[PDB]
Design a protein around this ligand. Structure first.
Ligand SMILES: CNC(=O)C[C@@H](Cc1ccc(OP(=O)(O)O)cc1)C(=O)N[C@H](C(=O)N[C@@H](CC(N)=O)C(N)=O)C(C)C
Ligand SMILES: CNC(=O)C[C@@H](Cc1ccc(OP(=O)(O)O)cc1)C(=O)N[C@H](C(=O)N[C@@H](CC(N)=O)C(N)=O)C(C)C
Lengths: 101, 101
């Protein structure tokens, strides 16, 4: 087992945009710990010449979700959205960013 | 910026012990998403011939903590405990696991 290449911890929202702007393929993403909402996570995803940000929402039990389907972990939320679009305006599927060697 | 080498997402508690048992230095650790408590995080740390597990607790606002000092992120909690012991029985400081090439 290896650590997940998508967890960047506490990095500025702007830093996520800077990084993902350099990614070549739509869907490139990262999970970060929100600075405006301590204790909450945010998902930043590249699409075209833009970087979209999503709030990782929680239900009453602590499960995570973006829209309707929820999961017992960020890990499962992320994997589910690799084959189900994170967007309702475009078909954008999460894919690991091109990691630096 | 690079992803954090300590976030393993949803892996079994037993898997964390298996991995950390192979680590050579005390303090080697990882943050995982609890399976017994969906939505909560757990910190697993190596020390001697054992692997200790800690619940990452949350206050009313969502801040994270192990004992008393709390943080706006898992990232900050982790960094704080690199220089302040996670244990009250031994001086154990978090240190990144020896990542596989
Ligand atoms: C500064 N405000 C925004 O960026 C609007 C973000 C949601 C968001 C709100 C705040 C936020 O703050 P940070 O963590 O970046 O500091 C991060 C993300 C948003 O609305 N995103 C769109 C959206 O419709 N999101 C849904 C679904 C979701 N889970 O975010 C929503 N707003 O409930 C998405 C399709 C790009
Ligand atoms: C199965 N139960 C345990 O492993 C006892 C764990 C806390 C814990 C409890 C449940 C747990 O479940 P998982 O996420 O591993 O499935 C993971 C960790 C514990 O008590 N750990 C010690 C401890 O005293 N922890 C404190 C401080 C803390 N934040 O965990 C506590 N229990 O409040 C620590 C010094 C090794």
């Amino acid at each position: 087992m290896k650590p997940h290449p998508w967890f960047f911890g506490k990095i500025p929202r702007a830093k996520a945009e800077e990084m993902l702007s350099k990614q070549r393929h739509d869907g490139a993403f990262l999970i970060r710990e929100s600075e405006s909402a301590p204790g909450d996570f945010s998902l930043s995803v590249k699409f075209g010449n833009d970087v979209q940000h999503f709030k990782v929402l929680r239900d009453g039990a602590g499960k995570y979700f973006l829209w309707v389907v929820k999961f017992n972990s960020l890990n499962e939320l992320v994997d589910y959205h690799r084959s189900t679009s994170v967007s309702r305006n475009q078909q954008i599927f999460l894919r690991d960013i091109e990691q630096v060697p």
